[PDB]
Fold:
Amino acid sequence: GCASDPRCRYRAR
Structure:
């Protein structure tokens, strides 16, 4: 869920 969110601490992509 965080990954999708841009606010995530780290990028998921």
